Amino acid sequence: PQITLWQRPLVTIKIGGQLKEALLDTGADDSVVAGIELPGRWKPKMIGGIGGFIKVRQYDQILIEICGHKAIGTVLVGPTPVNIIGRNLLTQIGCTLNF
Amino acid sequence: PQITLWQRPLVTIKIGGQLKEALLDTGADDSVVAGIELPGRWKPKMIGGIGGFIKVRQYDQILIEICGHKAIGTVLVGPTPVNIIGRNLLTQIGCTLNF
Numbered sequence: 001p002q003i004t005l006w007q008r009p010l011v012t013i014k015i016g017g018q019l020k021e022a023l024l025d026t027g028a029d030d031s032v033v034a035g036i037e038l039p040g041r042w043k044p045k046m047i048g049g050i051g052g053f054i055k056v057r058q059y060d061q062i063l064i065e066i067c068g069h070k071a072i073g074t075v076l077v078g079p080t081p082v083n084i085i086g087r088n089l090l091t092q093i094g095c096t097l098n099f
Numbered sequence: 100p101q102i103t104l105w106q107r108p109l110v111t112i113k114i115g116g117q118l119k120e121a122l123l124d125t126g127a128d129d130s131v132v133a134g135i136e137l138p139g140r141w142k143p144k145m146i147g148g149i150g151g152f153i154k155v156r157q158y159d160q161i162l163i164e165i166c167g168h169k170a171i172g173t174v175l176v177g178p179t180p181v182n183i184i185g186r187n188l189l190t191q192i193g194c195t196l197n198f
């Protein structure tokens with residue numbers, strides 16, 4: 001759908017059987033979700049934002065349903081304030097920026 | 100323009116005479132630019148992403164030109180890693196998220 005940006009572009013995601021709300025974030029290369037039990041292995045990764053870096057866990061091949069659209073990609077789990085759906089998932093659901 | 104998100108959505112800005120590139124960011128409420136000299140007065144405000152809060156200087160009524168589209172809003176000047184054009188400016192240039 002066409003999302004206007006007057007309010008925060010929050011969407012509902014279904015990941016690992018858990019229902020959560022997440023931000024459609026064009027300034028995020030990677031998607032980082034906090035507080036979800038995700039099974040399997042992980043590699044260390046450190047991602048940077050404004051104010052610095054945080055250490056998260058890189059989980060691969062995780063299925064995500066972002067507003068009823070299916071995608072499989074990389075999900076970082078760790079200390080974020082808000083759940084971020086970054087470009088690595090936004091491309092799969094065919095999300096574009098228009099103006 | 101229609102921007103696909105396979106590459107970072109970097110766009111040209113003309114702010115207070117200085118030319119710079121800035122990332123169109125749906126996940127940013129505010130706009131923050133690094134390195135520019137800006138006219139006038141400012142209040143303190145601290146803003147925070149993942150990682151932490153940082154101290155920025157907020158100047159209101161700044162004329163910024165985002166890819167030939169002119170807009171006036173609050174620009175925060177502080178040590179950011181990349182320049183961010185947040186939703187407060189994205190709404191004025193008519194930016195919408197589509198899928």
Ligand SMILES: CC(C)[C@H](NC(=O)[C@H](Cc1ccccc1)C[C@H](O)[C@H](Cc1ccccc1)NC(=O)OC(C)(C)C)c1ncc[nH]1
Nearest residue numbers: 027028029047048049050081126127128129147148149180
């Ligand atoms: C992995 C994501 C988290 C990260 N992106 C961000 O942090 C981007 C900007 C950025 C890109 C590249 C380098 C530095 C900063 C900012 C995010 O959109 C964050 C998401 C967020 C919102 C609210 C609370 C906490 C986090 N927004 C944000 O920082 O907004 C403000 C208004 C504070 C500038 C990123 N993109 C590329 C590399 N790292």
